[PDB]
Design a protein around this nucleic acid. Structure first.
Ligand SMILES: Nc1nc2c(ncn2[C@@H]2O[C@H](COP(=O)(O)OP(=O)(O)OP(=O)(O)O)[C@@H](O)[C@H]2O)c(=O)[nH]1
Ligand SMILES: [Mg+2]
Lengths: 111, 111, 74, 77, 852
RNA sequence: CUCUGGUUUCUCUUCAGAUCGCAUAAAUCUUUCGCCUUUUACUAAAGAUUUCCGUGGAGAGGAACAACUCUGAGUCUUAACCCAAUUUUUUGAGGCCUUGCUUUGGCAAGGCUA
């Protein structure tokens, strides 16, 4: 067996890559539930920045801490599904439309 | 349903390389010494601000240092001053530098 | 497997050897092999009469070794 | 390697009794037990076929020429 | 017994059977630097013997570090005992009493407490960091405490997954670590029979996280198991250490064929390990099935579905099995302790080995007098009652049996520091659960209930109506000195009793803690350092006393010395106006105080050897060398008391009559000190004259002792006095870049960098420096926060140094809240510590003189 | 050598203080101090409840294709060729006489042999 292959350093680097790039399986999250810059504003602010952006960093940290501190475990439900009930009803029907078409539709409906 | 996934290591490596521009290339949590949720909780509880950290309203009605009335304990004539006790020292060692540390969190030591 | 008997401790010590046939000899351990065949130096036959006779350096086949006893401290 | 052999090695450091093929009975501390049942013992009491006893400091008996061994009951569990 | 216990591979009945046979026991102490893997190693052993318990995939279980503070901080704070039945490579089973100790340099008292009752030491060394400060100090401590030391090189996976060194360079790194350890051992131990090398079996290689542990013997056993025609003993004898394999002749040689062949170790042990790890972490989806097929490992699809780290742990566990190399090492190179009892009694027992009880205990038989020795005190979760943890050196402890507990002050003449107690229950303490038993024989560790009341730190338990000639074991000698000092007060004075109870409880809990009440009614606590004191305060505020406490800012304890002989010879007279004494003071020579403290000399020595040493080494005339009377506050103190009074002027018989009183006065005076009432260090007190009253009721008692102390004070004050500061020795472990930052931070605080070197085979640097203890406060957090966490430092007390200023100067003016410049730090410290103690505002060199 | 257990998808019932969610909203009530004069804390903290956006597990029903990879189980090394002078399928430990002991029967010792 060869000591190393062409994808050995890659695996060793993946061992230390940050989450979720150190995994090889898992679940699917929501586009809302994935924040891209939380790690950016959890870090020390880069040196030589203006006061406004410095205070922006600090305030984002403040609200992040407040959420983390006030979080409470979710409660026990019975898993009732509004849209499933709607579909069960006779007043609604299923179909596939272009998202922009549906957006115009809902704009008109709200108007 | 698009619920769960299991990728291969070459796929993970390519995705990591592509996402590189959004990741800070940190291998340890030593970066976040006195800059993690526990340190922020302790600062909020003690009503103090880490230089780069957030700043909240006093959790408990703050004790006025001009109220205490010069006992033998707080006699300023016995103190030996070498370096001012910054907020960081109290955040790092809450129970040794503070009086009445309530709802204070111990911060993870070196890794 | 093909193990040695653990006899290094007994090397160059005086020993008392009980052999089959109710035979007994005494001498200094000079070596051994995996079959427990022994080399015994300055060997003496302890005849059933009580009389003892010097036979010199000898080979004892491990097959016919019942028991050995050290006459020294190991 | 046999199950009884493992249990024998377990008795190393304990007081055990050994009968040879010739019926001499040796009681004392088991120092070393080899895979082939070769037995090193110390501070022995030997009881011959005529009934007489003797005392020995150090002995070593070949496995083949052992009929059986009695081990402590400390092991049974 | 019969209480409920978790399922185990072995059985408690077999464990009870084993305890009786003191030949299959092993008392081991796991010690080493901070964060070097000891706790995870112990936990993996517990996992092996207890199938139900397990270490989480993402999080690491400890099964030590049970405390809430330990769990939150991530640093072991208290030593933890474990008792397991581990199987040996040969298939035999032994009983291991393993005391896992903390690593932080501040908690070395726990390590000393473990060593006192241990018989062997296992030193855990990280494979990347290598030798470090605490490893050096622990090697020194072990070889001085006369224990057998073996080594486990842990974290060997950092050479493969972090440094990714080539196999030959990894071998070189391991060899270098072994060489460093051997050098340290040879330095600190005269005997050369203790040499560490994997060939002998004194060194094991472990990766605790991924459950790897092996010795050359165990790996050769794996090879033999795969192919059954080799003696793994010979194979292991040949593997390590510059032995090149030759396959054409299938033989091992000291001469390398082809000038490119790898050593047998690199070829057989290291290289396949590299291969296994690389295949698991790089090719889990392409060739790992083939590699596992070759190795014979078969694992389920659900098992191979895991992530890389759990999969590595699983594959390595399947390949290696149990930690048999550790058991081999401990069994082969640690006393029985039937064998090791004799050195233990020789070193610890105060009555000497030659004593009849000395022999009876060196025998170490379960049937004999009871001579248990208790060194630890563990509190229940409720924090009400303490259980004494100790070892049984003779006899057998029985539940409900009345016993006699002797404290530290007990002596065969003053038999009042003893008390008759009634032991309630006994436990065989596994880390997180205690197996209750009804008796314990000699040669085992035991928890005892009902004997906590009459003991504070250490004690010895014997039987009443027997062992009348029983003497206590020596009190623990600690590896350092507790210097940092804080003052404590309740917030509401109505709750003082609760605070006092908490103070007593923490004093019991922490072996080297010293709590005291000053003259001004101030409750002071002495601790080793910042983290030590923080943990102590957390315990005092949350566990024991449930009240709120104000703490003063930390400060250190100083000493008092002289720099030149007394200006004039001084004297004093007893209130009876007889019994005049006359003394002079001077400074000792360099290093003599160190010799006295480190026991290079012993006042117990015969006067012949004492005078010989003093004459030959420190150029002392034999006349004076044979005139020694006392060695400072303790039997081993850094001050000496001699008498130069020639017999022509005074009666030697009368001086011998008053010798005890004069010595007591001298020791008390040295302990207190005139300047700020603190220890006097490095001073020679010479009695130049003494006129003694004839009648015993005219001399002795309350007449000479206060007069002797007053004369000592007068001589010290007449001699140019100075204060002495404590100095910590700091050792930072920083990246190759942050050395300049470390230099800056140290320079800011009167620090002085002795050295800064790289760590061979690692990308890091070690910077060794000296820092005043008083300025050390907050230094580590300053460094870490300025460097962004990449620099870490540990500090330990090193030595005493003279404070820059001159203390007995009244010209200086001190403002209340200003950092004074260097030249009058001495005066500032003196006056402020005087105020703290509550003494007069200042001292005059004629204060204790009789004339004014 | 054979017998279970499958995968996907839609829906219903119920439990979940597990980061049920590696993310994060709103409403009400209470206390606190704000600042108060009548109404009104976005720019403020604590506690409690509730509602919404989202999960797990288990059970039930439907409908689409795969049916022995794996999970185990029934079924526990089946045999081609060669072998035993320390631990059992090749073992030369074989006999007789005398004496003593023993109620006899029976047991111990020595010698003779080829
Ligand atoms: N890479 C690697 N890390 C390890 C290994 N073993 C332990 N560690 C890590 O080292 C750190 C120290 O863990 P512990 O062993 O529990 O600490 P300790 O040995 O008890 O030392 P103290 O905290 O002073 O008591 C942890 O963060 C572990 O994850 C190992 O084998 N390999
Ligand atoms: Mg630990």
């Amino acid at each position: 067996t060869p000591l190393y292959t062409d994808n050995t350093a890659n695996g060793i680097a993946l061992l230390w890559a940050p989450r979720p790039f150190n995994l090889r399986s898992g679940r699917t999250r929501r586009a809302l539930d994935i924040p891209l810059v939380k790690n950016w504003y959890r870090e020390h602010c880069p040196a030589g920045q203006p006061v406004k952006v410095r205070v922006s960093y600090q305030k984002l940290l403040k609200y992040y801490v407040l959420n983390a501190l006030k979080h409470r475990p979710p409660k026990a439900q019975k898993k009732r599904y509004l849209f499933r009930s709607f579909k069960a009803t006779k007043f609604f029907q299923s179909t596939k439309l272009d998202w922009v078409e549906v957006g115009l539709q809902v704009c008109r409906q709200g108007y | 349903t698009y619920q769960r996934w299991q990728f291969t290591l070459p796929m993970m490596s390519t995705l990591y390389r592509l996402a590189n521009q959004l990741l800070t290339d940190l291998v340890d949590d030593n970066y976040f010494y006195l800059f993690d949720l526990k340190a922020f909780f302790t600062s909020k509880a003690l009503n103090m601000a880490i230089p780069g950290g957030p700043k909240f309203e006093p959790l408990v009605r703050d004790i006025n240092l001009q109220d205490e009335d010069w006992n033998e304990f707080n006699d300023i004539n016995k103190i030996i001053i070498r370096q001012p006790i910054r907020t960081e020292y109290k955040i790092a060692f809450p129970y040794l530098y503070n009086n009445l540390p309530h709802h204070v969190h111990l911060t993870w030591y070196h890794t | 497997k093909a193990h040695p008997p653990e006899l290094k401790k007994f090397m160059d010590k005086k020993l008392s050897l009980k052999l089959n046939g109710g035979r007994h000899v005494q001498g200094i351990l000079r070596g051994f092999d995996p079959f427990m065949n022994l080399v015994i130096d300055e060997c003496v036959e302890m005849a059933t009469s009580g009389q003892q006779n010097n036979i010199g350096m000898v080979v004892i086949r491990g097959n016919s070794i019942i028991m050995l006893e050290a006459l020294e401290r190991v | 390697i046999g199950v009884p052999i493992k249990v024998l090695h377990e008795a190393e450091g304990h007081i055990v009794t050994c009968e040879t093929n010739t019926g001499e009975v040796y009681r004392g501390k088991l120092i070393e037990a080899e895979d082939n049942m070769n037995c090193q013992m110390s501070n022995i009491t030997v009881t011959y076929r005529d009934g007489r006893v003797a005392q020995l400091e150090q002995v070593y008996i070949r496995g083949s020429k052992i009929r059986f061994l009695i081990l402590p009951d400390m092991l049974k569990n | 017994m019969e209480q409920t216990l978790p399922v185990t591979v072995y059985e408690m009945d077999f464990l009870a059977d084993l305890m009786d046979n003191s030949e299959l026991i092993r008392n081991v102490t796991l010690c080493g630097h901070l964060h070097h893997g000891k706790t995870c190693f112990v936990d993996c052993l517990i996992e092996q013997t207890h199938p139900e318990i397990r270490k989480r995939y993402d999080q690491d279980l400890c099964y030590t570090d049970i405390l809430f503070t330990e769990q939150e901080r991530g640093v072991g704070i208290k030593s933890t005992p474990v008792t397991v039945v581990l199987p040996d490579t040969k298939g035999k089973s032994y009983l291991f009493n393993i005391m896992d100790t903390p690593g932080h340099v501040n908690f070395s008292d726990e390590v000393t407490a473990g060593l006192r009752i241990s018989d062997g030491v296992v030193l855990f060394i990280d494979a990347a960091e290598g030798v470090m400060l605490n490893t050096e100090r622990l090697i020194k401590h072990a070889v001085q405490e006369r224990l057998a030391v073996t080594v486990c090189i842990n974290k060997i996976d950092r050479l493969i997954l972090e440094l990714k060194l080539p196999p030959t360079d990894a071998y070189y790194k391991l060899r270098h670590i072994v060489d460093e350890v051997n050098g340290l051992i040879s330095m600190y131990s005269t005997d050369e029979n203790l040499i560490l090398s994997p060939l002998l079996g004194n060194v094991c290689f472990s990766s605790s996280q991924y459950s790897i542990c092996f010795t050359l013997g165990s790996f050769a056993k794996i090879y033999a198991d795969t192919f059954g025609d080799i003696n793994y003993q010979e194979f292991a004898k040949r593997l390590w250490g510059d032995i090149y394999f030759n396959p054409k002749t299938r033989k091992f040689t000291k001469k390398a064929p082809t000038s490119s062949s790898q050593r047998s170790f690199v070829e057989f042990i290291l290289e396949p390990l590299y291969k296994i790890l690389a295949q698991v972490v790089g090719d889990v989806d392409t060739s790992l099935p083939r590699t596992l097929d070759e190795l014979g490992i078969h694992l389920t699809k659900e098992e191979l579905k895991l992530n890389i780290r759990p999969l590595l742990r699983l594959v390595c566990k399947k390949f290696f099995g149990e930690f048999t190399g550790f058991v081999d090492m401990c069994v082969q190179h640690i006393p029985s302790p039937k064998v090791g009892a004799k050195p233990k009694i020789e070193h610890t027992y105060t009555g000497g080995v030659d004593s009849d009880l000395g022999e009876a205990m060196s025998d170490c038989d379960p049937d004999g007098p009871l001579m248990c020795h208790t060194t630890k005190m563990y509190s229940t979760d409720d924090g009400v009652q303490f259980h004494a943890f100790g070892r049984v050196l003779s006899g057998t402890i029985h539940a409900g049996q009345p016993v006699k507990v002797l404290g530290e002050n007990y002596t065969l003449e003053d038999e009042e520091d003893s008390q008759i107690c009634t032991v309630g229950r006994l436990w065989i303490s596994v880390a997180r659960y205690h197996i209750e038993v009804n008796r314990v024989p000699a040669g085992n560790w035991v928890l005892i209930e009902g004997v906590d009341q009459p003991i504070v730190k250490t004690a010895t338990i014997t039987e009443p109506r027997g062992n009348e000639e029983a003497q206590i074991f020596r009190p623990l000698k600690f590896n350092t000195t507790s210097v940092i000092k804080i003052a404590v007060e309740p917030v509401n004075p109505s709750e003082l009793p609760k605070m006092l109870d908490g103070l007593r409880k923490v004093n019991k809990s922490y072996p080297s803690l010293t709590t005291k009440v000053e003259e001004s009614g101030e409750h002071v606590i002495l601790g080793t350092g910042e983290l030590y004191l923080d943990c102590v305060m957390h315990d005092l505020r949350k566990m024991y006393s449930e009240i709120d406490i104000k703490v003063a800012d930390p400060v250190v304890t100083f000493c008092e010395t002289v720099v030149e002989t007394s200006s004039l010879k001084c004297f004093a007279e007893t209130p009876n106006k007889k019994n005049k004494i006359t003394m002079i003071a001077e400074p000792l020579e360099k290093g003599l105080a160190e010799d006295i403290e480190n026991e290079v000399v012993q006042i117990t020595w015969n006067r012949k050897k004492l005078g010989e040493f003093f004459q030959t080494k420190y150029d002392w005339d034999l006349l004076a060398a044979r005139s020694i009377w006392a060695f400072g506050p303790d039997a081993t103190g850094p001050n000496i008391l001699v008498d130069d009074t020639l017999p022509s002027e005074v009666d030697k018989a009368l001086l011998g009559s008053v010798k005890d009183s004069i010595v007591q006065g001298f020791q008390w005076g040295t302990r207190e000190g005139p300047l700020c009432d603190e220890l006097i260090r490095n001073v020679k007190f010479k009695i130049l004259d003494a006129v003694v009253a004839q009648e015993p009721l005219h001399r002795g008692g309350g007449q000479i002792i206060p007069t002797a102390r007053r004369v000592v004070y007068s001589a010290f004050l007449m001699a140019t006095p100075r204060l002495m500061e404590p100095y910590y020795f700091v050792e930072v472990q920083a990246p190759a870049d942050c050395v300049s930052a470390v230099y800056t931070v140290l320079a800011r605080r009167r620090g002085h960098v002795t050295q800064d070197a790289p760590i061979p085979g690692s990308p890091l640097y070690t910077i060794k420096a000296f820092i005043p203890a008083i300025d050390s406060f907050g230094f580590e957090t300053d460094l870490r926060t300025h460097t962004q966490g990449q620099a870490f430092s540990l500090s330990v007390f090193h030595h005493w140094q003279i404070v820059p200023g001159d203390p007995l100067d009244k010209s200086i003016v001190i403002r209340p809240l200003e950092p004074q410049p260097a030249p009058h730090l001495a005066r500032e410290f003196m006056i402020k510590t005087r105020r703290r103690k509550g003494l007069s505002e200042d001292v005059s060199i004629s204060k204790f003189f009789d004339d004014p």
